[PDB]
Design a protein around this ligand. Structure first.
Ligand code: ZN
Ligand code: ZN
Ligand code: ZN
Lengths: 78, 103, 292, 187, 187
RNA sequence: GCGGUAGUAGCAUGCUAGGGAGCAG
RNA sequence: UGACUGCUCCCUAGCAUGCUACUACCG
């Protein structure tokens, strides 16, 4: 339902973050792997929507890499 | 009859290793070898377990209508559905749990 | 690898193998380009070659497709059909094919040295995309022939302003240094930064554009990238715009020019324009005008 | 079927042996004609089975080809696709914290670290313009990721410690607006 | 089939029978018209069913012999790669400090675990945290395995050069911690 | 009238090899 | 970077057997 839609968006969020060569900083890849392994083992949709803000904020703090504007005006959340 | 854990057969079609099953038409043999393992769930008293087998038989047909319908709208090819219907019928899989071995 | 035969506007997946750019040809260009012009090679999602230990018969001539691969005549596992048959070449899109009435495009341009007058004049009577491909083949022929030239090197460091250079022996060597030579250096086995050098005079006098540090054995040779495909025409049809609506004109107007408001209104009600301007014909100060 | 070169033998002989019983003849003539029908019938039920196998064989090689060509465009476009997948999936969740840090980081308010979940939880974002500051924070209170933080220090481009009283659609045009606001979580 | 030694009989028997059809043929010559291309045709088919078997046999040694060649060429490329190794890992034995323990040995046999421990020039220490660092590798020199080693480099997990002043008690939270110290032997 | 012999085409079984994929400890 | 075993489904190539029609000689 809602706990299975968060558990599949955190598999696509650590693949976008693994294709951007975030594996080359082993002080931040060690936190992203702990916020993704912890969401998958969660048993409440109120304590897995707050590790999805920490994990998503890693992608929005990486500047140029992902064009957020283009990707949001691409028939998606406006 | 032996039957698996439903979360193991369901979770084996959702999570894979790219080009594998991130496009089901390029490998429909993965889902015929996963519906053989899910067959004896049809006899379970729980009706939420017996649905895992009918969900796999309905997806193999979806992946076959697409394949034989994706090679007709981009390449004027017409595939014949003869000897393909056996994989969404519950008699190809029932024969794997009955004596008098074959093949 | 599903490109487009823009010799027909047909969407195909083949390409001429022993050809200049290896472009996309349909089942009706790659049918007649091979028989007359000796391009006995086609490239697909998998090359049309024999598939049996040692074979050296690679000619999509009478090759037969069987057993999930392309076999040959000489040794015959024939039990199949030839690749070229019934005015077509085998491949995807074997049904949705259009054809071309100008057969001798490759037959005329894929064999010549891309310098004859006839090729150019028939090019200037083609369409926009075929001529775009012709210009990409001119860049591609220049770059292909760019790796058939000589190489410079220095094996002995001498005092400044007096060096020696040998290029090559017994091969057909003039070059108006237009684009200058920046190769990269070598010391023992790896690459070493050298910079860019200019050879104009020339024991042999050497000038210096900038200070550098010569090493023993430094080579010089140019590597040029390949022009990528583009997706836009060159010219555009003539279509006058509705009005000058959608612009922000300014209250102030120049007065040293007596042909400024007229041309401003003209560009306001005109879409595309070309002229024949010599140096100093508006390129100097009119850009600032339209800017302000 | 038709159009096969060996088809004008199963037509003449088929028509002949046929009509032959109305007019009729000796048994010899009948046997002779049947021993021409079968002699030029095998030639048809052999050239229309080899074709029957080539016509289906052809439609298989030209299907592995369709697979080796879609599976090389499915792999060369991975990057462009998983970013579209993720944002198609992020809209459907319709969360409130997730739909705030996304809208905020589209106008400019991106963070500079990970969003911490603790109670001290220092944060650093970059407000680019006055309107984004006015909407987000008023006073010493800051709203972000559906949570409330308390501003502890404001810093302009180099090290210019802005006091909260001198950022007001006024003194504001006179600074380097990409600020670096530091805050701590609340409770 | 143009060189099979049974084409002459078949060709002649065809000509005799087939070509002589228009000419009036009695019921006695018809046997020659019939039982002359027959038998000859049977033999020809026999001469063609053996040729087809000889061809295939032949084209099963001109494929199994490319594979015996391929493998020997390969056997000579690995036989020359292990050789180029066992002669490059040998020019690296400081044969003054190694012939000094094979000599003090009773018979010349020594444990292998004491060869890098007593006859090596470089030491690599991998350190998890800061507490372990000050009890193992403090300062520019340290003693280990009854010797004295002097630090030469301190890279980290990312493989970026660290200096021996970034390693504090409180700067430690700011380093990729599996730290790799490379030291050289003294005296 | 029938049987045997040698080729040819067509349909299933078993076995031997190669290739891709699924599960289990 | 990708271990050792066992089972099993699908596709292609080759070998032998099993009921038929076609050939042709032979009875
Ligand atoms: Zn060509
Ligand atoms: Zn074409
Ligand atoms: Zn071959």
């Amino acid at each position: 339902s809602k706990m299975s839609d968060v558990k599949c968006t955190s598999v696509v969020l650590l693949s976008v973050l693994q294709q951007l060569r975030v594996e080359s900083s082993s002080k931040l890849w060690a936190q992203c792997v702990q916020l993704h392994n912890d969401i998958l083992l969660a048993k409440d949709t109120t304590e897995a929507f707050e590790k999805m803000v920490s994990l998503l904020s890693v992608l929005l703090s990486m500047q140029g890499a992902v064009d957020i504007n283009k990707l949001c005006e691409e028939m998606l959340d406006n | 009859l032996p039957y698996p854990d439903p979360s193991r057969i369901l979770g084996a079609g959702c999570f894979v290793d790219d080009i594998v099953k991130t496009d089901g038409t390029l490998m429909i043999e993965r889902f015929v070898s996963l519906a053989i393992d899910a067959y004896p769930l049809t006899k379970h008293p729980n009706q939420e377990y017996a649905d895992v087998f009918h969900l796999y038989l309905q997806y193999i047909r979806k992946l076959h209508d697409e394949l034989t319908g994706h090679m007709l709208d981009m390449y004027s090819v017409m595939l014949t559905n003869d000897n393909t219907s056996r994989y969404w019928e519950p008699e190809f899989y029932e024969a794997m749990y009955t004596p008098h071995t074959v093949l | 690898a599903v490109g487009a035969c823009v010799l027909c506007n047909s969407q195909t997946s083949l390409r001429c193998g022993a050809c200049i750019r290896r472009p996309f040809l349909c089942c009706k260009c790659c049918y007649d380009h091979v028989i007359s012009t000796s391009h006995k090679l086609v490239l697909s999602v998998n090359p049309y070659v024999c598939n049996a230990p040692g074979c050296d018969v690679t000619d999509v001539t009478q090759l037969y497709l069987g057993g999930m691969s392309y076999y040959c005549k000489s040794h015959k596992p024939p039990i199949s059909f030839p690749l070229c048959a019934n005015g077509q070449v085998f491949g995807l899109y074997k049904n949705t094919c259009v054809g071309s009435d100008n057969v001798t495009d490759f037959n005329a341009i894929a064999t010549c040295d891309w310098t004859n007058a006839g090729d150019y004049i028939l090019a200037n009577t083609c369409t926009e995309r075929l001529k775009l491909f012709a210009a990409e083949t001119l860049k591609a022929t220049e770059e292909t022939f760019k790796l058939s030239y000589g190489i410079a090197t220095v094996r002995e460091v001498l005092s400044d302003r007096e060096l020696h250079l040998s290029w090559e022996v017994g091969k057909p060597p003039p070059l108006n240094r237009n684009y200058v030579f920046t190769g990269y250096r070598v010391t023992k086995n790896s690459k070493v930064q050298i910079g860019e050098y200019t050879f104009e005079k020339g024991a042999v006098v050497y000038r210096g554009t900038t200070t550098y540090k010569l090493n023993v054995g430094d080579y010089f040779v140019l590597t040029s990238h390949t022009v990528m495909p583009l997706s836009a025409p060159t010219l555009v049809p003539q279509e006058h715009y509705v009005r000058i609506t959608g612009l922000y004109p300014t209250l102030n107007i120049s007065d040293e020019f007596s042909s400024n408001v007229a041309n401003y209104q003209k560009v306001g009600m005109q879409k595309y324009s070309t002229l024949q301007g010599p140096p100093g014909t508006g390129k100097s100060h009119f850009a600032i005008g339209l800017a302000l | 079927f038709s159009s096969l070169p060996s088809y004008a033998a199963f037509a003449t002989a088929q028509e002949a042996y046929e009509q032959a019983v109305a007019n009729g003849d000796s048994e010899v003539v009948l046997k002779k004609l049947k021993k021409s029908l079968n002699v030029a019938k095998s030639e048809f039920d052999r050239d229309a089975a080899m074709q029957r196998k080539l016509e289906k064989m052809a439609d298989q090689a030209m299907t592995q080809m369709y697979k080796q060509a879609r599976s090389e465009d499915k792999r060369a476009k991975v990057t462009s696709a998983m970013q579209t997948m993720l944002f198609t999936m992020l809209r459907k969740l319709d969360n409130d914290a997730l739909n705030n840090i996304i809208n905020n980081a589209r106008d400019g308010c991106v963070p500079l670290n990970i969003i911490p979940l603790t109670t001290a939880a220092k944060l650093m974002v970059v407000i680019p313009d006055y309107n984004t500051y006015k909407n987000t924070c008023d006073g010493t209170t800051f709203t972000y990721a559906s949570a409330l933080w308390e501003i502890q220090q404001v810093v302009d481009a180099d090290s210019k410690i802005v006091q909260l009283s001198e950022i007001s659609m006024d003194n504001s045009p006179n600074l380097a607006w990409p600020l670096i606001v530091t805050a701590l979580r609340a409770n």
